[PDB]
Amino acid sequence: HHSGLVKMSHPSGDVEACMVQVTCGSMTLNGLWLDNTVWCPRHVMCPADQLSDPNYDALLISMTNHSFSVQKHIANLRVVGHAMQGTLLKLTVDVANPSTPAYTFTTVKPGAAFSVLACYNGRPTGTFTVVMRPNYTIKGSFLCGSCGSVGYTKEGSVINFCYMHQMELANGTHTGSAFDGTMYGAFMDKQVHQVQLTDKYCSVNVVAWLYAAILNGCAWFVKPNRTSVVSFNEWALANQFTEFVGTQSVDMLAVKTGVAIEQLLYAIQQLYTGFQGKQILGSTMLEDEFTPEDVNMQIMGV
């Protein structure tokens, strides 16, 4: 019955030891301390009455190393260099973080999951996991003072930082930047109304979820009928679904269950029109917040 699926985050200890407070004048938020560098959102430079359409190039010129104050609560880190990369600041400090994990920087793609360490005044307060939506937002839980909170995946011992929180959109979702300084999607780090693209169902995640149902004995939606990937994807474009792109992790689920991807693509088409009062894994609507990897790890132990 119960699927054994939860929203699972990485353990956050490694990253907790990297979080700091960055203060610049009257703005304060979080930064990420790795080696001799502290990363943080650039709108920390901004006075709270210029946050809509600020000029960051001018703000940057007006700053010196002494404009920034960096404190660890969980020390005082003297800022000895400062630079801007896209929407992030890159502050150099005199002391290297002795608990710097092995890490990389990467970009996360729509439908992929990552873990977030929510932080306030440099103090980690919670952790959760999200999927990057097709419109390059996340359905997170961020309040005032959460900017600089980080998102990350993990491969073995290596932490892949992929997200630094910047803002909340009119519809309550959230977005931020990659550590190359680019905002995700077409968003800008300005407090003005911005067009929001439409979200979509992440087809590959829905397929993963239907497989999870099969692994827990729920398979009434499976028929011999099949829909080609190419045919589904044409359908997808007209129905607010991402185009499907199989992966080795989805293939493993097809092998373990003996149900072919194309049978579940047909199933999605029929379910999108209605569940007819039936339920799948307790839900009466499609679920796209679990990835094929989540299903492989949590249900199959792979």
Catalytic residues: 43, 145, 147
Member of 69, 121, 191, 216 binding its own copies (CB under 8 A): 216
Any contact of residue 282 with Ca ion (CB under 5 A)?
Answer: no
Member of 85, 107, 269, 298 binding its own copies (CB under 8 A): 298
Nearer to Ca ion, 99 or 247 (CB): 99
Binding partner selected for residue 285 from its own copies, Ca ion, none, CB under the kind-specific 5 to 8 Å limit: its own copies
Token pair listed for 201: 């169902």
| Count of other CB atoms within 10 angstroms of residue 141 | 13
Token pair listed for 107: 């970009």
Q: What angle do CA 71, 74, 78 make, to 5 degrees?
A: 20
Any contact of residue 173 with its own copies (CB under 8 A)?
Answer: yes
Which position has the token pair 């419109």? 135
Any contact of residue 171 with its own copies (CB under 8 A)?
Answer: yes
Any contact of residue 140 with its own copies (CB under 8 A)?
Answer: yes
Member of 50, 65, 141, 247 binding its own copies (CB under 8 A): 141
Site for Ca ion in 95-114 (CB under 5 A): 100
**β-pair type (174-177, 158-168):** antiparallel
Member of 56, 105, 128, 272 binding its own copies (CB under 8 A): 128
Tell me the per-residue interface mask from 123 to 162 with Ca ion, x by CB under 5 A, - otherwise. Answer: ----------------------------------------
**β-pair type (37-41, 68-71):** unpaired
Handedness of CA 43, 46, 51, 54 (dihedral sign): negative
C-beta separation of 2 from 44 below 8 A: no
Any contact of residue 4 with its own copies (CB under 8 A)?
Answer: yes
Token pair listed for 35: 């080696």
Any contact of residue 2 with its own copies (CB under 8 A)?
Answer: yes
CA distance 101 to 201: 34
Q: Phi, psi at residue 282, to the nearest 5°? A: 80, -15
Q: What angle do CA 48, 115, 243 make, to 5 degrees?
A: 100
Chain positions contacting its own copies, by CB under 8 A:
1-13, 16-17, 117-118, 124-128, 130, 139-144, 171-173, 216, 284-285, 298, 301
Interface residues with Ca ion (CB under 5 A)? Answer: 4, 100
